Amino acid sequence: TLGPVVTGTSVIAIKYKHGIMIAADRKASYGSYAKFQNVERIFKINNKTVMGFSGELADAQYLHELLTRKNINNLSEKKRKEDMYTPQHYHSYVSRVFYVRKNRIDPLFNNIIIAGINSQKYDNNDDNVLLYTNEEYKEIHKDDLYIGFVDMHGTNFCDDYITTGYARYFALTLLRDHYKDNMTEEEARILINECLRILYFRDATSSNFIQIVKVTSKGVEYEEPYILPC
Amino acid sequence: TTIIGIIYDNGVMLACDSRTRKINRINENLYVCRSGASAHSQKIIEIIKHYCVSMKNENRKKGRFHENLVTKNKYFYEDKFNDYNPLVENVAHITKKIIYTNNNFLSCALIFGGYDKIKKQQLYAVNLNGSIIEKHDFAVSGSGSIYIQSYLQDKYKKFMTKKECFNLILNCVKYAMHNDNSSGGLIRIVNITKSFVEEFTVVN
Amino acid sequence: YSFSLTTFSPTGKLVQIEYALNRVSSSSPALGIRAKNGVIIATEKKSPNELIEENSIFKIQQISEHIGIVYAGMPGDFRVLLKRARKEAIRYSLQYGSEILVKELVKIIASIVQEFTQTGGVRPFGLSLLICGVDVYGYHLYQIDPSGCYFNWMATCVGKDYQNNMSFLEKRYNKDIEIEDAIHTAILTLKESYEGVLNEKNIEIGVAYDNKPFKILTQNEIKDYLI
Amino acid sequence: RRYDSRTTTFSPEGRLYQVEYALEAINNASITIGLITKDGVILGADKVFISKLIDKANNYEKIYKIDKHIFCGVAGLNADANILINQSRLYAQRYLYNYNEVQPVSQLVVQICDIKQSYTQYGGLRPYGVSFLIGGYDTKDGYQLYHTDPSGNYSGWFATAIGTNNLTASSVLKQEWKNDMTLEEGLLLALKTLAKSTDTEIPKSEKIELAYLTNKDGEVYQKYLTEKEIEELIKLYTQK
Amino acid sequence: TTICGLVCQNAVILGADTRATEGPIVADKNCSKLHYISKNIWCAGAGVAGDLEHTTLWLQHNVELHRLNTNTQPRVSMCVSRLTQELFKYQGYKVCAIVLGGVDVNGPQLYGIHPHGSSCLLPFTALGSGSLNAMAVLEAKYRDNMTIEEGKNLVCEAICAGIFNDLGSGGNVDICVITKDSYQHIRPYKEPTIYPKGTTPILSEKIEYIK
Amino acid sequence: MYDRHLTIFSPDGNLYQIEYAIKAVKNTNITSVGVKGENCAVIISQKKMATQYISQDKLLDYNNITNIYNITDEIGCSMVGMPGDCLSMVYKARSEASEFLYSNGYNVNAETLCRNICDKIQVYTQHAYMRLHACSGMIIGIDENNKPELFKFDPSGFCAGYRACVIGNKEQESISVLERLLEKRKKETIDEDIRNTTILAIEALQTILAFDLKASEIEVAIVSTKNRNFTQISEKEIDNYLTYIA
Amino acid sequence: AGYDLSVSTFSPDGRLYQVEYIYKSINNNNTALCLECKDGIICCCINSNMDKNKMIKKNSYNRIYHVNNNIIITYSGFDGDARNIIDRARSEANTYYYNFHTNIPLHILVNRISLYIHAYTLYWHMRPFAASIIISSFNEKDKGDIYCIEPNGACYKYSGIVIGKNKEMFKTEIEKKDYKDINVRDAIEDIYKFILTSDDHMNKNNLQNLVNFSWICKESSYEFQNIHEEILTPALNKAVEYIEK
Amino acid sequence: RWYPYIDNGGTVIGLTGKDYVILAADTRLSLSYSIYTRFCPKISKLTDKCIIGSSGMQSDIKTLHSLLQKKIQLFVLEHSHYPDIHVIARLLCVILYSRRFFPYYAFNILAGVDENNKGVLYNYDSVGSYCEATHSCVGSGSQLILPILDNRVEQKNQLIKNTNFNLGDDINFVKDAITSATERDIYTGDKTLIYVIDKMGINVNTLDLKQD
Amino acid sequence: IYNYNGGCVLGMSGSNCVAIACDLRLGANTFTTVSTKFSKIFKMNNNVYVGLSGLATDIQTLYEILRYRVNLYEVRQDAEMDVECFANMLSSILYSNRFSPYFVNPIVVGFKLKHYKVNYEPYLTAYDLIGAKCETRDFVVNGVTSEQLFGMCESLYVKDQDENGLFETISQCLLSALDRDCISGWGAEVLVLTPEKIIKKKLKARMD
C-alpha cells in the first residue's frame, strides 16, 4: 500500500493457435534477497481466464481473492454457459478497481495481465463447472482470444502479446521483431524460452525456474515447472 | 531478533532467542513467532487470539462423536482427532488480512506453526504488508536469521528425525546469536507434533 | 416509532406510576434508620429453600466506600440502577477526586428515573430505592420512587404493609438513638412485619459506622444480635 | 401505530387534551404564593405532609434557587420540577458564560417556556406537568415575578397564588396587597394568605416555608426562613 | 526521575525518588511518584506527569468499578491489558513508561509498560533518567527468593545510587511494599532573613471583611 | 386495552408478558438438572425434540439433538425453551465471554456471564419493541478459587446461584427430590466425588421424569478440577452408570 | 384475541400465533423433498400449483440453488423471502472465504441462516420470513448431511426430509425402505412414483415440465449438478409404465 | 509519496468548414520513453453528429468519454431527443468542473455539426474553461501545429489572402499538419484516424505515419 | 508562545494566612506593552483563588469555563466548593484538551476547612499546561519569571509567618523577580487572605 516490499519479476502472455500461453518465473524477491524461490505468480479466475502479476505480492493476493470470489458469485447465479463472464469483463472490472484506487491515492503496486478466451462456441467446459478436482486442441481465431494490460494509474489496452516489468524492453523487442501469427505451440514455447533466457541473463530479479500455463479449448493447464535449458 | 522454523517428519519445530518470549501460544496446536515492532506485534497477537477463540467455539459440532540445561514441559492435546481445533490456514489468512488492512502502519513479520488433521504439520510466513507464503521446508525471520540462511540451506534434509531437527535448529539459533549483535539470551524452542506439544529452553 | 407509553389521564395521576407503586407495595419490605452516629438499612429475604444460597443473591449493595443501598421491587431494574449508580459515582470521583456526596448521587438517580418515566417506548422502573450514606455533611438517608421524586428521611420503611411498619418505627424512635439501639429497633420492626419466625439467612443488614467503611453484617453477627 | 397515545394532537376545539390534564394535576398540588414589595419578592409556599419522620432541617421541597438573583417555587410533579430546575440552572450559567453578565429573568423564563412548548409540539412525548413562579431582580427591570404553566405560557404579576385553592389566595392578595410594602408586611401578608387558603386559622410553623430575595447593599441575596424565624413571624402575626 | 521495582518472597517492592524538574531547574523537592491503584496493586511511571496522573486515576477507578461489579480480587493482567490497549489506541503519543507491581491470586508479579503500548513481565526493572544506574546495581546484587528487609535494602541501593549519580533524579526515597494481604507505603524512608514592617512601598489599599 | 400486549405494568403491578414467556419456556417440557458437589459440577438433560408444530420423524439424526452447549472451554451451559431463542442466547453468551476475555485478559467467570445475560434480558423487558426471549438456562463453571459454581436464569432476567436446580416442568415437585438427595449426600477421593455427583444427577433425573432414561435419550456433562473443561460423557459410561443405579 | 396481530406479543397460553400462521402458509405451498443415498444426495421440487399456467417455458421455474457449487439449498414458500435468504447465505459464504480462505463448513452456515431468520421474529415492524429452507451436502468421507431450517428459527439434521403440500404422504413413502443403501441413479424411479402417487394434480405430461431435480453425488464429482434429460426421461417413463399396470 | 498523473502523450487536431468538421488524432499510447501499443484511438463517438477527442491520461480520457456517453444516453432516454452540441459542451464543462480539486488530466476538443448544418468546435482546458473556435489542437503537438493552423485559416500577416477552401483541401491540409507533427515530434504517433462530420452522417479514414 | 503577552503569578503560605500576588502587564508581540491593568488573579470562591498566566485569550476562556463549572456545582450542592475538589476539577479540565491544549499554566491558592469548630489550612498548588498537579505546601510560582521567583522564594522564605511578614516577603520576592524580566512587570497586585478578612494592595513597582 505504501510501497513494494516483496515483488515479482515479469510475465509474458502471447496468443497462438489453440489459445494463449503465459509464462512467469517462480520467485519473489525481498529487495535484493530472493527469499522465496517457489511462488505461483499466475492465478486462475475461471476456465478461459487467467491473471498475470508483476509487482507487490500482497496486492496481487488481494486482487486474486476479489476476482475468484467474483467468479464464485457469477457461477452461483449462472444458468447457461453463455452467462460466464468473459476476459473482457474481468479486464474492465480490474481497470475500474485500479481507477478508483488511483482516485483515492492508494494504488496497487502491480501491473496486471488478464488473458483468456471471450468466445463460447468452441468447447462445452463451462456447461458443467468443477472448481475442486479436474481429444485434440481446436484452432482458435485470434479474434476470439483476449489479452489485456492494466497499469498502476489504470491505463489499460488490448493486444496480441503483452509483457510487464523488465520484459517490456527485452521480450517486447524480441516479440515485435519475430512474433508471427498462428504459430504452433512448439514455436510459441521456443520464443517464450528465448525471451525468458534473455531476461535471466540481464535481470537480477529474474530466475530460471519457470512456470508456464496454457488457456485452450481444454481449459486452463498448469504445465509442470521446468528449469530453463540455458 | 532471530526466528526459525523447521518442518521435520511428523511434527514441526520453532526456535527463537530472548532479547529486546517471542513464541506465543495461539492454541494448543497453534503457535506463532513475532519479529519487528513489539507493540504492533503484541496487539495483533491479542487480536488473532481473540479471533481464534471465536472460531474454535463456533466450529464445535452438536452431538456425541467418536464412540546446558534443557528444561522441558509437555502438554497433551485436549481435543483428540482435532474435532474443533481451528485450521492453521484459517488463522494464518485472517492474520494476513488484518495486517493487509493496516499495512500503512503495521510492520511486523510473523511465522505460524501448527498441526492440523486436514494438512498435517504446516509452516506459514506472513511478511511485511499482507503477504502470506506457505513454506514446506523451513522459514526464517529477523535480523539474525540472515547470517544462518545459507547454513540452513546446506544442512536441511527432506525427512529429518526429531533429534536431527533439534540439533540443526539449536545450532542455527546459536550461530545467529553469535554473529548478530541484536540477538541474545537463552534459546526457546517448541516442538508441535500430532498428539502433543513440548516446549523447552536451552541456556547455552 | 418512539412515542410516550406513559401519558396523562383525566385528572392526570400517571396511571403507570401508580401501577409501579402498587408493584413496589407488594414486594419484600425494607427499612432504614438514621442514628446519632450511623445509619442502618435492613431488609427481609423470604425463607429460602435448601437449594438457594444467600451468598449469591444480595439485597444490600454498596455504591462507594461509604454509601449503601437497599431496594424493594424488580431485581433486574435494581441491578441495572446499581450499575449506573456505581458508574455515576466513579465519574464523580474522576472529576472531583473524592467520594460522591449522597445528595448529588440521589439527584442523578432521580433524574435517570424521571427520564425513564418520560421517554417513549419504555415503562417506569418497578422498584423503590433506598440510599444511606455518610459524608462531610453528616449522615443521610434518602428514598427514591418510581415517579423519580426523592425524600429526605430520618427513619422509614417501604414494601408490604409499609404503613404499619412506619407507624411502629415512629412509635419507638429518637433523634439521639444509639446505633445498636437502631439495629435493635430495625430487627424488631422486621420481626413484627414478617408474620412468622425470623433467624439468620432470613434478614440482611448494612450499617455505616461513623467514619468507617460501610459494612454488611455477616451471618454470625446478626445471629448474635438476634439473641 | 396501534398503541399510539395521540399526545401532540389538537383537540376538536384546539386544546391538545394533554396540557388540560397537566393543568388539572397542577390544580391538585400544594399552594404556592408570590408577592413583590418595596424591599424584595416573596415566594411563601405550603408543605405537603407525608409523615412525622421527615427531616425538618433544610429539606426544601417547594422553593429553589436558579442563580444568586433568581429563585422560584414549584406547584406540580417533583421529578419534572427537578429536571426543569436543572435546565434553568444550565441556561443561566450558559448565558453568563456567553455574555459575561447575569441573565435577566425574562430571558430565563422565555427559554424555559420555549423548552416546554417544544415538548408540547414536537415528538409524541407527554408535556411537563409543572408550573413555576420565577421571581428575582435585575438592573434592567428591577424586582419581577412571573407564572408559567405546561403550555409554555407566561405572564407578569405583582401578586399571585397558584395550585390548589389558588382562587381564595388570589382573592386575598387582590383584597389586601398594596403597591408599596415593607418586606415584613409582605411576609405577614404571605403568611395570612397561606393560612386562609389552607383553611386553617393559624398556620403551623412546621407546615409552611418562606423565602425572599433582596438587593441589599447592591448585592442581591436570598434568605430562606428557618423554623425559628417562621415561629417568630407567626408570633408577630398572631399579635396583630 | 528514578523508578525501580523488584519481586521478593511472596511480595513486591517499589521504590522512587522525590524530585520533579521543569527543565534545568527543580520545581518540587518532595514529589510523590508512587501511585495507589488498588489495595494490592501499585504503579510508578516516568514521562509526562499529566499523562501519568490522568492515566493512573482512570485505571484506578476503572479497576475499582470492575472489582465492585465482579466481586473478585483485582488482577495485574487486567491492568496490563488496559494500559496496553489505551496506549496503543493513542499511537504512543501519550509518553508514559510505567512499572506496575501487584500480588494477585497467581502470586506477585511486575510488569513494564512502554509508551507505544508494549508490555513485558520481569522479576526486576527500573525506568527514568537514572534507570541505567539503578538497574545496574539491581542486576549486580539481585537474587531470587529474597527477604523483605533485604529487598528494601536493595531497593535503596538502586534508588539511592540513581539519586547520587543521575542529575535528573534526587531528593528523598519513597518505597512501597505490596503483599497478598495488606500493603505498606513508607514515604520518607531514608531522605539522604525577615524584612522590617513597612519596608515595601505601596500606593493603594482596600480591606474587605469576609462574612 | 393492551395492558398485557406489551411489557407494560398493567393494573396491580403485573408484567404479564414475563409470565407468558416463562409459561412458553415451561411448555417445551424438556427437563434439565444441575448439581454441584466438591471440585465437580454435573449438568444433565434429555436428548429429545422440543414441543412445537414439527414432530420428530424416523429420518432424524437423534445424535444431533442436544440441549447442552458450552460458552467456553471451561464454562458450560444448558438452555431450554424455544429453539431459535436458545440458539440466540448461546450465541450472545459466547460473544460476551469472548469480549470479556479480550477486554480483561483473563477468562470470564460464570457468575459475571450470568449477570451480563440477566442485564440483557432486563433491557429486553424494559422496552416495548423487543420481544422476550423465552429460554431459561443454567451455567456451570469453576472459579479462580478452584471451586465449582452453578447458576440459573429465567426469561425475567433473575439470575440466581444454586447448589441443585432444575429447569422445565414440575420444578416445584422436583425441589423436594433434589433436597432429599442432597441431604442423603450430606450424611472422598477427588474422582470418587465425581462419580457420586454423576450418579446423583442421573438418579435425580430418573426420579423426576419417572422412567428408564435410555442412555441414548439423555446427555450428561461435567466440569471438575481433574479436567476443568466442559466435556460431555459418552454413551457407554452413561449406560454403565445407569446400570449401576438399577 | 389481539395476541395474533403482532409477532412480538406472547399469547396467554405462551405461544406465538403469528408464527403458526406462517407455518400454515408454508404447508400449503409447493412441496420439496430431499434425501441421501450411497453415492450422494438428491433434491427434488414439485411445482404442482403452476399446472394451471400453460405459458411458462418447460422447466424454467427452478427452486433449487447452490452455494460454493457443492452445497444444495432449496426452499418451500414465498419466492421473495427465499431469494433474500439465498443472497444472505451467499454473502455469509463470501465473508467466510475472505476471512479464512476456505469454504464455510455446512453446520456453521446453517446456524448463521437460522439466526438470520430468527432475528426477524422479535420486532413488530419487520415481517417474519415465510419460508422453510433445506440445506444439504455430501462428501466421500463424511457422507451426506441434510439440515432443515423453519420460520421459528430451528435447525435440525435429517436423513431425509419433505416440506410443503402432502408432506405426510411423501414422508410415509420415504421411510418405506432404507435409502442409505440405494444408489443415487436408481432412486429417481422411487421419487417419481412417490410424486405421481401422493400429488393428485400431476400426471404423465406434467412430470417433464413441473418437477425440478438435482443431486450431489460421485458422478458429478460431489459438485452441484442439475439432472439432464437423457437420465431423467428413462426413469420417468419406467415409473409411469409401472404405475399404469 | 505517489504522484497520480502521467502524460500518455499524443495529438488531436480539429478544423471547421462552412458545413462540416474534420477531427484527426494519433493512435499511439506511450509511457515516459517507451510505447505501450501502436493503436489506441482517442476519438470517441458521442452522437450521430458529435464526437470528442482528448489528450492526457489514457484512463482519465476513457472514463470521461464513457461517463459522457452514459449521460447523453440517459438524456436521450428520458427526454426523447438527441442533445445538441451546445448542450453536450455545457454538460462536459459541468462534469469537468465537478472535479475542480482533483481535475482530470484530459485536454478536450468537442466537434460536431449544429442543427443548422454549421461546423462547431469547442476547445476546453483540464479544469473546465472552454471556448468555441474555428480550429484547435490538443496534446503534445499543440504548440507545434497551432501556428500552422493559425496561418492557414485566419491568414493574418498576409496581404494577398485566399479564403477559397473546400472539403478536399481541408482534409489534405490536416494530413499535412499531422505528418509534420509526426516528423517533428516524438509523442505524436504512427497511425492516425481522420473523422469527417458532414450533413450526411460521419465517416472515418485511416492514414499511416512514421514509426520511430 | 508564552513570550507573547508574558506574565507572572506567585503564592505563599504563612500561619493561618495565605498570599497571592501577580503582575499587571498585557503586551503584544512580546516587546510592546498594551495595558497595565490585566490582572492574572481571579477570585473563584470565598476562600479559593486561581492565578492564570499565559495567553490572555486562553486565560479568559479558562476563567469563564471554571466559573461556569464552579457556579453549577455550588448551586446544585447548596454549599461552598472545597479547594481539593476545585484543584481536581481544574486538572481534569486541563487534561480534557491534552491535544490542542490551553496555553495557560495556572496555580490554585486557598484555605482547606477541617470541620469538627473549624480549622483553616493553607493550600497551594501549581500546574503544567496539561494539568501536571504537584502539591508544594510552600511558595508556588508560575510564569515566564519562574526561575527568578524560585530563586527569590528559596532565598527569602521563612516558613510559617505572620500576615505582615508574609506580605513583606511575597512583595519583595515578586518585585525582585519582575525587575529582572523585560517582558513582564508593569505593576504588581498582592492579596493577603485570612479567615477574618482579605487585604488587597497594589505595590509601587517599577512601571518601566
CSV table of N, CA and C in Angstrom, one decimal, chain A residues 166 169-171 173-174 191-203 206 228:
chain,number,residue,atom,x,y,z
A,166,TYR,N,10.6,-5.8,-16.5
A,166,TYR,CA,11.7,-5.7,-17.4
A,166,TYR,C,11.5,-6.4,-18.7
A,169,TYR,N,11.0,-4.5,-22.2
A,169,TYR,CA,12.1,-4.0,-23.0
A,169,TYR,C,12.8,-5.1,-23.8
A,170,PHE,N,13.1,-6.2,-23.2
A,170,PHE,CA,13.8,-7.3,-23.9
A,170,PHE,C,12.8,-8.1,-24.6
A,171,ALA,N,11.9,-8.8,-23.9
A,171,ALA,CA,10.9,-9.7,-24.5
A,171,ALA,C,10.0,-8.9,-25.5
A,173,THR,N,10.9,-6.4,-27.4
A,173,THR,CA,11.7,-6.2,-28.6
A,173,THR,C,11.7,-7.5,-29.4
A,174,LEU,N,12.0,-8.6,-28.7
A,174,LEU,CA,12.1,-9.9,-29.4
A,174,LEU,C,10.8,-10.3,-30.1
A,191,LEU,N,9.9,-19.2,-28.6
A,191,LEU,CA,10.0,-17.8,-28.5
A,191,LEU,C,10.0,-17.3,-27.0
A,192,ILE,N,9.1,-17.9,-26.2
A,192,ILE,CA,9.0,-17.6,-24.8
A,192,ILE,C,10.3,-17.9,-24.1
A,193,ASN,N,10.8,-19.1,-24.5
A,193,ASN,CA,12.1,-19.5,-23.8
A,193,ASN,C,13.2,-18.6,-24.2
A,194,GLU,N,13.3,-18.1,-25.4
A,194,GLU,CA,14.3,-17.2,-25.8
A,194,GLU,C,14.2,-15.9,-25.0
A,195,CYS,N,12.9,-15.4,-24.9
A,195,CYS,CA,12.7,-14.1,-24.2
A,195,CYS,C,13.1,-14.3,-22.7
A,196,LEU,N,12.7,-15.4,-22.1
A,196,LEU,CA,13.0,-15.6,-20.6
A,196,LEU,C,14.4,-15.8,-20.4
A,197,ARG,N,15.1,-16.5,-21.3
A,197,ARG,CA,16.6,-16.6,-21.2
A,197,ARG,C,17.2,-15.2,-21.2
A,198,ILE,N,16.8,-14.4,-22.2
A,198,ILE,CA,17.4,-13.1,-22.3
A,198,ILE,C,17.2,-12.3,-21.0
A,199,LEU,N,16.0,-12.4,-20.4
A,199,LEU,CA,15.7,-11.8,-19.1
A,199,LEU,C,16.6,-12.3,-18.0
A,200,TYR,N,16.7,-13.7,-18.0
A,200,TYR,CA,17.5,-14.3,-17.0
A,200,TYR,C,19.0,-13.8,-17.0
A,201,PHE,N,19.5,-13.6,-18.2
A,201,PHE,CA,20.9,-13.1,-18.3
A,201,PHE,C,21.1,-11.7,-17.8
A,202,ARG,N,20.1,-10.8,-18.2
A,202,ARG,CA,20.2,-9.4,-17.9
A,202,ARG,C,19.1,-8.9,-17.0
A,203,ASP,N,18.8,-9.6,-15.9
A,203,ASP,CA,17.8,-9.2,-15.0
A,203,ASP,C,18.1,-9.8,-13.6
A,206,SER,N,15.2,-11.8,-11.9
A,206,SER,CA,14.7,-13.0,-12.6
A,206,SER,C,15.3,-14.3,-12.1
A,228,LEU,N,15.1,-23.6,-17.1
A,228,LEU,CA,15.5,-23.2,-18.4
A,228,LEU,C,16.7,-23.9,-18.9
